[PDB]
Design a protein around this motif. Structure first.
Motif, PDB file in Angstrom:
ATOM      1  N   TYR A 160      -3.161  16.671  -8.480  1.00 35.48           N
ATOM      2  CA  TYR A 160      -2.019  16.199  -7.702  1.00 35.48           C
ATOM      3  C   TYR A 160      -0.807  16.079  -8.614  1.00 35.48           C
ATOM      4  O   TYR A 160      -0.263  14.990  -8.807  1.00 35.48           O
ATOM      5  CB  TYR A 160      -2.358  14.878  -7.020  1.00 35.48           C
ATOM      6  N   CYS A 198       0.252   2.998  -3.527  1.00 40.90           N
ATOM      7  CA  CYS A 198      -0.892   3.825  -3.870  1.00 40.90           C
ATOM      8  C   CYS A 198      -1.283   4.735  -2.723  1.00 40.90           C
ATOM      9  O   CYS A 198      -0.962   4.481  -1.562  1.00 40.90           O
ATOM     10  CB  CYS A 198      -2.107   2.997  -4.295  1.00 40.90           C
ATOM     11  N   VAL A 199      -1.975   5.813  -3.075  1.00 46.31           N
ATOM     12  CA  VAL A 199      -2.668   6.663  -2.120  1.00 46.31           C
ATOM     13  C   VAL A 199      -4.131   6.259  -2.191  1.00 46.31           C
ATOM     14  O   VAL A 199      -4.843   6.626  -3.134  1.00 46.31           O
ATOM     15  CB  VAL A 199      -2.483   8.156  -2.425  1.00 46.31           C
ATOM     16  N   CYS A 200      -4.574   5.485  -1.210  1.00 40.70           N
ATOM     17  CA  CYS A 200      -5.888   4.855  -1.230  1.00 40.70           C
ATOM     18  C   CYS A 200      -6.820   5.675  -0.355  1.00 40.70           C
ATOM     19  O   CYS A 200      -6.743   5.611   0.877  1.00 40.70           O
ATOM     20  CB  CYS A 200      -5.803   3.411  -0.743  1.00 40.70           C
ATOM     21  N   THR A 201      -7.692   6.452  -0.991  1.00 40.89           N
ATOM     22  CA  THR A 201      -8.622   7.329  -0.300  1.00 40.89           C
ATOM     23  C   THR A 201     -10.050   6.966  -0.681  1.00 40.89           C
ATOM     24  O   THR A 201     -10.307   6.480  -1.785  1.00 40.89           O
ATOM     25  CB  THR A 201      -8.363   8.790  -0.639  1.00 40.89           C
ATOM     26  N   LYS A 202     -10.982   7.234   0.230  1.00 43.10           N
ATOM     27  CA  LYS A 202     -12.338   6.710   0.136  1.00 43.10           C
ATOM     28  C   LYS A 202     -13.288   7.721  -0.490  1.00 43.10           C
ATOM     29  O   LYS A 202     -13.383   8.861  -0.029  1.00 43.10           O
ATOM     30  CB  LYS A 202     -12.872   6.323   1.515  1.00 43.10           C
ATOM     31  N   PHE A 203     -13.998   7.291  -1.527  1.00 46.47           N
ATOM     32  CA  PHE A 203     -15.228   7.956  -1.928  1.00 46.47           C
ATOM     33  C   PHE A 203     -16.404   7.337  -1.194  1.00 46.47           C
ATOM     34  O   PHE A 203     -16.540   6.108  -1.166  1.00 46.47           O
ATOM     35  CB  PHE A 203     -15.478   7.849  -3.430  1.00 46.47           C
ATOM     36  N   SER A 222       0.803  -1.214   0.000  1.00 48.48           N
ATOM     37  CA  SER A 222       0.000   0.000   0.000  1.00 48.48           C
ATOM     38  C   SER A 222       0.841   1.270   0.000  1.00 48.48           C
ATOM     39  O   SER A 222       0.275   2.367  -0.030  1.00 48.48           O
ATOM     40  CB  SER A 222      -0.924  -0.004   1.209  1.00 48.48           C
TER      41      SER A 222
END
Lengths: 49, 49
Positions: free
Chosen positions: B11, A29-34, A26
């Protein structure tokens, strides 16, 4: 006369709950939530080079 | 029915940091500046041997 059957032990697995951030893949990636992604139609990101 | 037009986080910020003295190729130089130069026709350098 005396006879009997028997049960000896009952064994199970334990499913390992795996958080994705327990991995260090991980980093990649930059794993951000929608909370909403399905209603979005435009998926463009602006890049400034 | 919901329609969305979403622009995401831009970004991408490309940075360039330049200094000729942080390069150590300025070891191989004698850098001086005229604060105004271009009026001059012909500068010369005298060597005595």
């Amino acid at each position: 006369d005396v006879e009997f059957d028997a049960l000896l032990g009952s064994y199970c697995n334990t499913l390992s709950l795996v958080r994705f951030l327990e991995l260090g893949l991980s980093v990649a990636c930059v794993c951000t939530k929608f909370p909403e992604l399905a209603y979005m139609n435009e998926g463009r990101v602006q890049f400034e080079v």
